C-alpha cells in the first residue's frame, strides 16, 4: 500500500487529472500560481510572473512573503521542504477538494514537485536568498542560504516529468484564460505571462 508522494507518482490522475490530454499539465501551473494568489489575497503579493521556456518548463515567480524557511520542529527540515515533500492532508475531508473531473482542487505544490523531473525552489525571506532542488519530489540537498536580498518572494521552476505526462506542450490560450480570471478577482496583483517559445508577453491587470 503506497502512501505520500509514492501514491501520487503511481496514480497521478487521481491528483492532477488527465496526464495525456493537457488537463493535468496545465493544472501543474495553476497549482503553483494559486499559492502566489494566496499571498495576493492576504495582501502581500502584487507581482506574479509565469514563464514558458523553450524546453516546455515553467517558472513562476512572486513577490509575496516567501515560503517559510525555519526548521520545522517535528520534521527537522525547513518548513519549505515540508511543504514541498509532504502531501497535505488538511483538505481530504473538505467538499472543495474533489472535482467532477480533472483530479483534485488545491492538491498542493508537493504534487507538482512529485510529477516534475526537476524543481528548483528559490526563496527570498528575512533578507536572505535560499535554494533547494528536487527531482521527482526528492530533495537533492537541504534548503541552503545562497545570498542576500532586500526583497521577498518565491520562485519555482519546474520541468514536468515525461514519465508522468505525454504530449508536453503548454498552451498560451489555456493559461491566459485562467490568468484573466485570476487578474479580475485579485485586482492588487499584476500577472505577467511570458512565452519564450514564441516571444509573446502580456501583462494582465484588473
Ligand atoms: C510560487 C509559490 N509561492 C508560494 C508561497 O508564497 N507560499 C507561501 N506560503 C506561506 C505560508 N504558508 C504557511 C503554511 O500554510 C500555507 C501558507 C506562511 C507564510 C508566513 O506565515 O509568513 C508565508 C507564506 S508564502 C508557494 Cl507555496 C509557491 Cl509554489
Ligand atoms: Ca490552494
Ligand atoms: Ca515581498
Residue numbers in the entry: 14 to 219
From the paper:
Validated targets for the development of new antibacterial agents include bacterial enzymes DNA gyrase and topoisomerase IV (topo IV), which belong to type IIA topoisomerases. During DNA replication, DNA gyrase removes the positive supercoils ahead of the replication fork, while topo IV unlinks replicated daughter chromosomes. Both enzymes are heterotetramers, composed of two ATP-binding subunits, GyrB or ParE in DNA gyrase or topo IV, respectively, and two GyrA or ParC subunits that bind to the DNA. On the other hand, GyrB or ParE inhibitors block the ATPase function of the enzymes, depriving the bacterial cell of the topoisomerase activity required for the replication process.
